[PDB]
Amino acid sequence: AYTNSFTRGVYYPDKVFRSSVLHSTQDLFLPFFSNVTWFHNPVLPFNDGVYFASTEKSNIIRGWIFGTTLDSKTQSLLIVNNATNVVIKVCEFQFCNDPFLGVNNCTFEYVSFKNLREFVFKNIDGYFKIYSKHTPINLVRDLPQGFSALEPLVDLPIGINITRFQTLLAAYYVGYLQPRTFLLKYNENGTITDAVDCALDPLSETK
Amino acid sequence: CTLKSFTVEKGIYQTSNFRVQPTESIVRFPNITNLCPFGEVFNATRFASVYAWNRKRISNCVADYSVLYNSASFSTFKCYGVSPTKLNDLCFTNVYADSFVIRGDEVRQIAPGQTGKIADYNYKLPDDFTGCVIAWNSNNLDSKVGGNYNYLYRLFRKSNLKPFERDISTEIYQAGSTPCNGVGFNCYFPLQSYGFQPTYGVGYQPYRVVVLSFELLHAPATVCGPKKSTNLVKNKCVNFNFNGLTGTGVLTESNKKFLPFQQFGRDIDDTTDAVRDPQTLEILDITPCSFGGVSVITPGTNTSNQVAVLYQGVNCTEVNVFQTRAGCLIGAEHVNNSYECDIPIGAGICASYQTQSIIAYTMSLGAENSVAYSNNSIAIPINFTISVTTEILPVSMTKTSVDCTMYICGD
Amino acid sequence: TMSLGAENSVAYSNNSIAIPINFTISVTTEILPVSMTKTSVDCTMYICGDSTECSNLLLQYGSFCTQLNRALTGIAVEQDKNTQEVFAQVKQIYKTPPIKDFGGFNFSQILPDPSKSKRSFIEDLLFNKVTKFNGLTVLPPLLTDEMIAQYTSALLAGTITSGWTFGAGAALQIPFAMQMAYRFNGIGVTQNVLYENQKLIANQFNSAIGKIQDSLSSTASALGKLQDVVNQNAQALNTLVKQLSSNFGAISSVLNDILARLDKVEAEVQIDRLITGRLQSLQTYVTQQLIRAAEIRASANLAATKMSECVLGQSKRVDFCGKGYHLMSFPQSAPHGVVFLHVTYVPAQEKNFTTAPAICHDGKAHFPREGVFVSNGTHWFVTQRNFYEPQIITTHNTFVSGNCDVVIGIVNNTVYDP
Amino acid sequence: ALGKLQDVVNQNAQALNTLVKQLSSNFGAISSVLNDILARLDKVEAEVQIDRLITGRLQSLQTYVTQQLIRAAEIRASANLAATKMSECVLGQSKRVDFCGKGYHLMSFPQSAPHGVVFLHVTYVPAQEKNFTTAPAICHDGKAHFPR
Amino acid sequence: GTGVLTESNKKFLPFQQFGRDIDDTTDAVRDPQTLEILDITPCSFGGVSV
Amino acid sequence: ALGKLQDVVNQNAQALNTLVKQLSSNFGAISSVLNDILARLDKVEAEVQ
Ligand SMILES: *[C@@H]1O[C@H](CO)[C@@H](O)[C@H](O)[C@H]1NC(C)=O
Ligand SMILES: *[C@@H]1O[C@H](CO)[C@@H](O)[C@H](O)[C@H]1NC(C)=O
Ligand SMILES: *[C@@H]1O[C@H](CO)[C@@H](O)[C@H](O)[C@H]1NC(C)=O
Ligand SMILES: *[C@@H]1O[C@H](CO)[C@@H](O)[C@H](O)[C@H]1NC(C)=O
Ligand SMILES: *[C@@H]1O[C@H](CO)[C@@H](O)[C@H](O)[C@H]1NC(C)=O
Ligand SMILES: *[C@@H]1O[C@H](CO)[C@@H](O)[C@H](O)[C@H]1NC(C)=O
Ligand SMILES: *[C@@H]1O[C@H](CO)[C@@H](O)[C@H](O)[C@H]1NC(C)=O
Ligand SMILES: *[C@@H]1O[C@H](CO)[C@@H](O)[C@H](O)[C@H]1NC(C)=O
Ligand SMILES: *[C@@H]1O[C@H](CO)[C@@H](O)[C@H](O)[C@H]1NC(C)=O
Ligand SMILES: *[C@@H]1O[C@H](CO)[C@@H](O)[C@H](O)[C@H]1NC(C)=O
Ligand SMILES: *[C@@H]1O[C@H](CO)[C@@H](O)[C@H](O)[C@H]1NC(C)=O
Ligand SMILES: *[C@@H]1O[C@H](CO)[C@@H](O)[C@H](O)[C@H]1NC(C)=O
Ligand SMILES: *[C@@H]1O[C@H](CO)[C@@H](O)[C@H](O)[C@H]1NC(C)=O
Ligand SMILES: *[C@@H]1O[C@H](CO)[C@@H](O)[C@H](O)[C@H]1NC(C)=O
Hints:
The structure is cut from a larger assembly and holds 6 copies of chain A. Chain A is an all-beta fold. The first copy, chain A, has a single domain, classed as Jelly Rolls (Sandwich). Chain A contains 1 helix and 17 strands. A 7-stranded antiparallel β-sheet of chain A has the order 1-4-15-6-11-12-13, with no helix packed on it. In chain A, a hairpin with a 4-residue loop joins strand 11 and strand 12. The longest helix of chain A is centred in the C-terminal third of the chain and has 5 residues. Chains in contact: A-B, B-C, B-D, B-E, B-F, C-D, D-E. The interface between B and C is large, with 46 and 58 residues. The site of one 2-acetamido-2-deoxy-beta-D-glucopyranose has 3 residues of chain B, from loops. One 2-acetamido-2-deoxy-beta-D-glucopyranose (NAG) binds next to loops of chain B. Chain E: This is Spike protein S1.
């Protein structure tokens, strides 16, 4: 199954405050009106980066696995979130698609339908970034036509090679970032309020 | 001095830029106190083979680079995009220390934008490299009796390495139609060794290499030089340095609504408008100290040596004294009368030399008149005056021409 | 494919003339830019700013920063000259009487409102529709908008109370209806055509000023000629300031980062790439501002000529002071320019008549002294050519020249001898 | 009195004095004097020093020519205005307000000046006005009369 | 250099070896073997028109 | 008679011919041909030329 992303997946592109200005930026962004996949499970490719979103009510989704092999020979990144802690760990893990049946030469460790949770995963320069947003919505969870920007959670210097990922278990959406130029509307009190995807159509290229 | 003459005609002349100078100087570095683990690299037991170079990430420490660059031990200490003398004043988001051994002739290949066997098959630096390459002779350590074969390089590959690409693969290379087959004629095992012997000639002797790669982003620092922080000063004009962001301006308390991840702010022209203090959750607005043009208002020097001074756009609280909308005007007397404009100051103000001193006044547009209009009154001339008025028009310039070859190259 | 206009076969023949039965007073609007914003750039503060290291390198290039600052100063001082050439033409600040007995013509929308700057109602419509640390400075104009409004007020009060006379010497008063009768007489329409139609002519003028007020309140798109002078200067400055962020091949575009990272022998090599590129960036801007200032000077010289010839006079130059035969025009100020409200006579309801070059009386050819011979079916009359008023043919309305035999198209008719 | 003609002389002098002074600038070479560089250095290094002088002197001369092209168009506008004044004002009698001096124009006379022309504009200016009552028309035997 | 050389009446003080003018030009010189002051002038030049 | 119109046509042709002929100039580089510089020289030297 598939869905229209509308204008979802915009994020704050740098750690710089701006107000009452239009900023034009090139980065890995989810293209406007892009064709996102929908799911109940499987391992998926990661490409240049992932936009991910889910139905925040039943709280069944708890984390992710990222890597190449997902089972030995080389490291994989594991993320798990529960009521007391977010935990992030990097190891030569040998689990199947359910490390929570338990839970390996570890090299890094770190600790910290009514609602829509949105995430961006990106692996470039200073390696793995996470951005997110959590907001209330009307009961049809079909990626609403409004606008909001994802804010950085963490920025991890881990140096890992990622080509595939999988969810740890509700329904969820997946889309892929692309090298794209955006014009961002920072309105007042630091806040991004609108954007133009400059390559979407000739009118956006004119704007 | 501005006009390059001893005589000045009546007028208003631009002569200088006025500036407030900084009354104090500031350094503002993060709360960190432990020395960076450089000794874990420069005094390591051994480094890897150059095809398999070893990277350490350095963070969350003070880096006294003088401990490195003062030492006579280093047979090479080159920097790119920075000067080694200057590193103790800088701050970096991360530092990556890369380590390996190569022969003394090949150290030339460890530089930005090179081509060659080591540069393109073993360790490639980027074109816009910022960092330092540090190397020293290691024939006392890495060379051994009968030769040391623990040190290797890749001699053959399908394609050249990208900057900081790493490739430890042992797979057979193919130089012709011959399939690799785990072996042959025009097919090769791609890895080779120096075999370092303590009797080798100095170009074939081993050199240890450490490359330090520095990154400075739109981000916090985590490695800083040992330069001590000092007390913050506000509302004065100050010279400052926050995490290596050197500048000058008035620092104010400010109410910019920074989100928790934002480390500094920018104006509509990308100038840095505000910063977060690296020792407090305090947001400081950076405003430039007072500056602007200075214009001197003068009658002719044939008439008087008095002058008045206009500080353009400047406010008289922050430089007789009079606030025009053109700027603060000093040495000209304000007058409640109005006259024809003599020297034009701007926004309706003019100045003149009168009963004597320089005066400044609102200009008068002409004599006020009411025409005696009525629905049945005319007025008719009883007489006339034949008037002759001179009009002067320029028609031509001097017909200059220049031999551009003789102007430029002088025969 | 664009349309050039509707086709019109004109009904020409060797003996047909069309003459207008009636007229419309037309009030056309013309907008002209006169001056720019007086922006000036310090070449050393733009190229370097704070840095002594960059400043000492910039001295090796010699006169260029004095030559650029001299050129921008010449452009800035000329904007005050352009504004003096247009508005400061009146010798004395004339004022209207407190009693508005102008023969039924109503100037309330174009004279000052003293309750307010003391601008007119239309000058406030015109002022509403139009809308620091990099070495850039903006200087104020010499005349404030309140001083420009005092000049347009004096020019307008002189025009209404004294006709063209205030442009030729002292203002001599004349009743406004008698001034309008001489502006009619100046376009070849006889004076009685005003006095016999004075309430219609006054109502057509008052109505046409109401259409200007409504049009200027309705849309900003008319003032695009002034707004483009703001937009061209803004795009030039936005480009000049953006060019500070360019590397030009230096390690950074931030001069303080070069000075914080490198020692003199390396820093001076990187800084000279910024000096070279920033100097070329400023030389390009001053060159295009010198060429743009010459276009505004030409438009200020045109506006100064339109004020002398259209406002202080009555132009006979076709289409100089609006379409139709020019009666008079009125100046209204606008930000960076001037607006002329051109009052013109437009003939409105043509009728066809048979016509002849001359008539035969007692074997002699009579020609019309002023006007045209026209025939109303069976009868012959003489008329002024710009408004139908059929006079009887008489020995006073006509002059003789020789026999009937020479003229092509002459007609036999009686001449009355009073 | 002739400040317009003297201003055109002064601008051409300031432009040439600036062009000449720019021969004394280094532009980043080891000397501003082209004969020093060739008396001190061999071709391989002298070509580096000389190309800095070529680059700065060519930019100095392109700036002068561009400003003389812009200044000549301002003189051509004044010469086309002076040519129009001689036709309409000297060879005729102008009816254009302010074109040929203040007052109603009678005639004007040309006199030559260095790089310019002077027009002596002769005009009728009215004087000594007196009021009088006025009327648009007069009633005779019921007929309304207007002045010719 | 290249130029015409002539006598001059330039009043060089005892410490002055050469004179200058604003084109970066040496305008005059003291001869080192016989301390007279020489004017330097460009050899005659101009455009050619056909 | 029509020399004013032909002069305007000739000036625009001469300015374009001059603009295009300036592609053959070296400006101090080893060659005026952009591919030839990249064939002769390695990255850091070629980019200065
Ligand atoms: C693209 O979007 C349309 C409309 O939602 C959908 O039918 C189609 O299957 C999508 N195709 C792919 C390859 O995602
Ligand atoms: C899960 O919850 C337990 C509660 O005791 C806590 O110890 C742990 O840190 C949490 N996170 C993970 C990934 O186990
Ligand atoms: C990451 O791992 C995959 C495994 O198939 C490999 O193809 C790829 O070359 C690796 N990434 C990089 C940047 O080399
Ligand atoms: C931020 O700006 C928006 C503008 O709509 C306003 O609603 C909000 O109250 C502002 N926040 C603060 C802290 O003033
Ligand atoms: C920084 O260190 C000082 C003591 O040197 C301490 O009082 C202050 O709370 C620290 N601030 C932060 C943000 O760590
Ligand atoms: C000048 O500065 C003072 C102090 O801030 C202020 O009261 C005054 O209004 C200012 N005047 C102008 C014209 O800037
Ligand atoms: C007109 O003026 C002249 C001087 O210009 C004078 O001699 C003459 O008497 C005046 N005539 C009248 C009627 O005022
Ligand atoms: C002339 O036009 C006016 C309106 O402009 C109209 O009221 C009047 O009746 C017309 N007169 C004739 C003779 O057509
Ligand atoms: C003049 O016109 C205005 C606007 O229509 C009107 O309010 C005013 O009463 C008129 N004045 C006279 C004297 O008719
Ligand atoms: C004048 O005559 C022509 C030809 O008869 C006719 O087409 C036109 O409509 C007439 N115009 C008027 C105003 O009567
Ligand atoms: C004008 O012509 C009509 C016929 O078209 C005629 O009835 C009328 O009498 C003529 N006018 C005069 C004043 O005779
Ligand atoms: C005009 O009158 C003359 C003399 O009576 C006569 O010869 C001629 O034929 C007449 N022409 C017309 C058109 O009536
Ligand atoms: C005309 O009348 C007015 C008002 O009575 C008066 O001011 C003026 O002096 C009179 N004389 C002249 C020559 O204007
Ligand atoms: C040589 O040079 C000196 C310079 O002072 C001069 O006095 C002398 O006459 C010259 N000739 C000889 C033969 O010394």
